[PDB]
Design a protein around this ligand. Structure first.
Ligand SMILES: NC(=O)c1ccc[n+]([C@@H]2O[C@H](COP(=O)([O-])OP(=O)(O)OC[C@H]3O[C@@H](n4cnc5c(N)ncnc54)[C@H](OP(=O)(O)O)[C@@H]3O)[C@@H](O)[C@H]2O)c1
Ligand SMILES: CCC(CC)[C@H]1c2ccccc2CNN1C(=O)/C=C/c1cc(Cc2cnc(N)nc2N)cc(OC)c1OC
Length: 162
């Protein structure tokens, strides 16, 4: 199974200066819950932003850099390598990987950040005409999580006659 995992705001901003534009601990917990025991595939810039592999999942980094070798990280050099990965694979970011993969994935786990942030990187446009809402869950707000957000699980719709 191949999924996208992403947080984007009302204008599909996902990043600014190689960081998340928002501080939202619950979304990172959401991410942890979904991906534990599975595989993350991420672009090189996304990896460098995080700075270390996330524990208790397979960390796969896509890069053209043949010198890339980081302890606890598997490296691939082509999109086509993604399909050889076993198990449940999450496309983890960033913009380049989402653009390359949005037409290929089975489904998407999207956190809609219900705000408008300054960004320099974006999730590609998509339409709910093509995507069934398997679930939509409002994130709970508290002292440490102050931005309204919604967890979407979207599944690609089949093209059928009439
Ligand atoms: N909000 C979210 O859910 C979320 C999630 C993840 C990331 N982000 C944000 O996204 C932004 C980064 O996105 P980005 O597009 O600038 O960078 P990125 O996708 O994280 O990484 C880009 C790099 O990935 C490698 N790559 C991508 N496609 C490749 C291919 N077909 N073959 C070989 N290598 C390939 C290249 O590495 P080399 O240049 O080393 O070859 C490329 O320069 C940051 O702002 C980050 O904070 C947001
Ligand atoms: C530190 C708290 C948490 C969970 C307690 C911590 C963690 C700790 C232990 C075990 C697992 C995990 C999983 N997570 N962490 C991270 O430290 C990584 C976050 C992260 C993640 C992304 C990609 C991303 C974010 N959000 C959504 N919805 N989709 C995505 N693909 C980008 C980023 O910076 C561009 C990130 O660094 C901010």
């Amino acid at each position: 199974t191949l999924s996208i995992l992403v947080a984007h705001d009302l204008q599909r901003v996902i990043g600014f200066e190689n960081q998340l534009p928002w501080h939202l601990p619950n979304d990172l917990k959401h991410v942890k819950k979904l991906s534990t025991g599975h595989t993350l595939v991420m672009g090189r810039k996304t990896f460098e932003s995080i700075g270390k592999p996330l524990p208790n999942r397979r960390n796969v980094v896509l890069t053209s850099d043949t010198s890339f070798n980081v302890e606890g990280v598997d490296v691939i050099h082509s999109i086509e390598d993604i399909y050889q990965l076993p198990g449940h694979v999450f496309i983890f970011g960033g913009q380049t990987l989402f653009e390359e993969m949005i037409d290929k994935v089975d489904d998407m786990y999207i956190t809609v950040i219900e705000g408008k942030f300054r960004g320099d990187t974006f999730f590609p446009p998509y339409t709910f005409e093509d995507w069934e809402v398997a679930s939509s869950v409002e994130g709970k707000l508290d002292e440490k999580n102050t931005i309204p957000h919604t967890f979407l699980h979207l599944i690609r719709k089949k093209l059928v006659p009439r």
